[model samples]
Target: QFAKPEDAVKYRQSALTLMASHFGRMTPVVKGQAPYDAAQIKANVEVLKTLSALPWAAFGPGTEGGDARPEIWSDAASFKQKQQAFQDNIVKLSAAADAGDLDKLRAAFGDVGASCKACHDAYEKKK
Candidate 1:
């Protein structure tokens, strides 16, 4: 999909940026600072699902750099495992969104965040 290594880096970075934006915006709703609009939350999570699947393709061989650590390529199995966990959490999050359950959504959201943190901690270079 990417024409070059730089293109891959940019693609993944852009996807992750949007992921953070979409995920972060729900913080207030989850925290009870904002109203939980089930419809809106579901729509946002749909978008998130699409975004979640984008970055991995960009992680193909020869595509390195950005905030990515070499461990991503060197320890490929572990990296794939983390990706699966993140995706699994997203599935749970989608279920919560579909059910319009705020409590479940909050828990699923934290799980997803933890998944992201776990991968970043292991595979992303320190900022």
Candidate 2:
């Protein structure tokens, strides 16, 4: 869909930046640094669900670079597996948000973070 490979890189990077922004916003609440607001958290998670699916489409062939590791293109299967794992946890996180269960939210949030980190460790270029 991107007009250029650079555009694809930009698209994926932008999507990932927003994902980190949305996901990180809830960290305080999950860590007990901020008070839980069910409505707000739920709203953010809804946005997050949308963002979670955006980055991958831009990772197609010839669109490599940025913080992405070469293995993302070389090891497509593992990359897809990580993406599915992240999406699965997003579903649990959405459920927790819908239920307004802080405990469940915390657990699901941690799982999602772990999935993110695992993939990053394996497929993201180090800074």
Candidate 3:
């Protein structure tokens, strides 16, 4: 059982917030809006990859009570599939970023964004 429902929600939210921060920083670079800087892009990608591995198991009872939608718990299979796709896409994005190929990175970046949106659209609270 979770220590407390609030604690579990905090843990889940904390990790997700950090992940968003890292991804947010990379967006401009990924979209080619920011000037090309291999180091900067790669750095942001590394941070995203690092945060991606965080265990989201704390998304239990307390977590379900908060910002996350009920579908995440009720439709466990779908949520898991979406989560896996996000993970896979992030790895692909990191590989593209590390290669320092602008075109490749841009393509992979779209995949990453799509994966994120898929999960967020289905699971996250709209408001």
Off by over 4 Å in 1: none
Note the residue pairs that clash in candidate 3.
Answer: none
Query: Given candidate 3, what's the lDDT at residue 24?
Result: 76
Task: List model 1 lDDT by residue over 1-127, tens digit each.
Answer: 7788999999999999999999999999999999999999999999999899889989998888798998899989999999988999999999999999999999999999999999988998996
In candidate 1, which residue pairs clash?
none
Error of 1 at 23 (Å): 0.5
Scored against the true structure, residue 109 in model 2 reaches a CA lDDT of 97
Residue 42 in candidate 3, Cα distance off native in Å: 1.8
lDDT of 3: 0.80
How close is every model to the real structure, measured as TM-score? 0.98, 0.96, 0.86
* TM-score of model 2 (CA atoms): 0.96
- Candidate-wise lDDT, in order: 0.93, 0.94, 0.80
Query: lDDT, candidate 3, residue 37?
Result: 90
State the lDDT of candidate 3 residue by residue for 15-109, as single tens digits: 88898888777677766677989877888889888788673677654366668888888877888888888989988888888988888888887
